[PDB]
Design a protein around this ligand. Structure first.
Ligand SMILES: C[C@H]1CCC[C@@H](O)CCC/C=C/c2cc(O)cc(O)c2C(=O)O1
Ligand SMILES: C[C@H]1CCC[C@@H](O)CCC/C=C/c2cc(O)cc(O)c2C(=O)O1
Lengths: 268, 267
């Protein structure tokens, strides 16, 4: 039942993408690691509730690595938003519900403010608004040190379930190995200052549902909870940390289905 | 530093410590009721021109001589009246107050209930939700409550296992006796008594709110939402529930700078 293919956009990207189901469109935008295999279990469960679910590897990452250096260096929310609009255009998806975590969160808030005709509703999780010294310092190391550093962060620190992280399998971890240096050089220095949450009055009234990981240290996304509350945006918790779609895929799929159904009710 | 006892008309015999001269700062303990956790910070705060007072809480540690009403069905409003009682006995008429956990509930009830006595309040990690796993501990035997909660404090909420163990055997022996008292008196009655149900009563008050930097987001998520809705200053301290144990110099600086900010805004 699942389409696994490639499609080329006039910005020079050859995207790897996957697609399952029929009904209203839901688009799962990956985190900075740009790896859409992490959504595998959830794509099926969500599509089974009467939706067409699309996801993709992000430009320069995993199977979407045939792309111009412009698409994976000095990356901003506003760039990533324009690239997602290009693949939606190429797949004839006119109106979409969107999910994003981390740099994906910045992207989906950028899609909702920048292309409101295209976005039914956005789900953002743990939107990075602060430069982090220790992530930025990795950008200057050698490829194999970055990979060994960030691989152990993901496994031991921020996976929110190391068993489920490992069970992604050898083939996934070999793609992630290659993505770590690309991400370290292109993302942590430029993503946070691009965060589209400078203007709280721009967020008020929009179809946005904001989450943070229940197990994440409070300091990491404290700023997200303050901004959502000041803007009157629905803000809540998912289990786990930065990868609820890996650590708790059934709770993640249920959240995406119920949030989308609530906005289909309020459309009508 | 004065280390002494004092009796109040409500039948509590308080153990208390007091150091320095200048405007009054009162350090209210967390639910475990042990004021030795403030020992280093009391000196640093007092050296900056303050009179610093702390005390063991009713029925805990060296304030154990007290009526059973003082450590059963405990609410913020009850603890607020007992703090006022020892403040009256020490002739402290205007004070800055710190409190963590059930202490945080106490200092917000102090600020609302007795506005003429309280210059400003610092509240840390105010418990607003019943926790079934904590409520259920109270119906076990003493020695299994102590073994269990001694382990929770160290591994889950200390925010610094080495500084927690460095408190020493004398302190850990008092905590050992306190756990059953705390288990039976606090976790089932403190959260429903949280004085944060009315957001509008908080707006414009001299209240400074913190949460622990390393605490899981789910624990005090509700505090950040409430503070933000009421326009109350909300920020972080390093560690978890015991910043005065895990990061005592950062704790002292926070208490001094907050109090100095409110002395300026007074005049
Ligand atoms: C891929 C996830 C890793 C989650 C670990 C995550 O817990 C590491 C700390 C939080 C920051 C994530 C982040 C920061 C940036 O400046 C840019 C980004 O693209 C991310 C990001 O997408 O991070
Ligand atoms: C002893 C402190 C810190 C305990 C760890 C503390 O971080 C355990 C989880 C947070 C709740 C603490 C708590 C809850 C209540 O219902 C009543 C209370 O008096 C407390 C309380 O004072 O907790």
């Amino acid at each position: 039942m699942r389409t696994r293919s490639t499609i080329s956009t006039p910005n020079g990207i050859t995207w790897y993408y996957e697609q399952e189901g029929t009904g209203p469109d839901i688009v799962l935008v990956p985190d900075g690691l740009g790896e859409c295999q992490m959504f595998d279990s959830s794509v099926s469960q969500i599509a089974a509730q009467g939706f067409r679910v699309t996801t993709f590897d992000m430009p320069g990452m995993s199977r979407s690595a045939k792309a111009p250096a412009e698409t994976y260096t000095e990356v901003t929310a506003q760039k990533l938003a324009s690239y997602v609009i290009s693949i939606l255009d190429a797949l004839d998806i006119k109106h979409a519900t969107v999910w994003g975590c981390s740099s994906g969160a910045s992207t989906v808030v950028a899609l909702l403010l920048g292309y409101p005709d295209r976005i039914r509703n956005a789900m953002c999780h743990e939107l990075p608004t602060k430069l982090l010294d220790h992530l930025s310092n990795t950008a200057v190391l050698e490829d194999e040190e970055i990979s060994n550093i960030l691989a152990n962060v993901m496994l031991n620190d921020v996976s929110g379930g190391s068993e489920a992280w490992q069970a992604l399998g050898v083939e996934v971890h070999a793609r992630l190995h290659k993505n770590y240096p690309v991400w370290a050089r292109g993302y942590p220095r430029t993503i946070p200052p691009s965060a589209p949450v400078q203007d709280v009055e721009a967020l008020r009234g929009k179809p946005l549902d904001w989450t943070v990981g229940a197990a994440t240290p409070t300091e990491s996304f404290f700023d997200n909870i303050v901004t959502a509350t000041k803007a009157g945006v629905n803000i809540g918790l998912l289990p786990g940390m930065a990868f609820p779609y890996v650590s708790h895929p059934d709770v993640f799929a249920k959240y995406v289905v119920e949030t989308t159904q609530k906005h289909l009710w309020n459309s009508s």
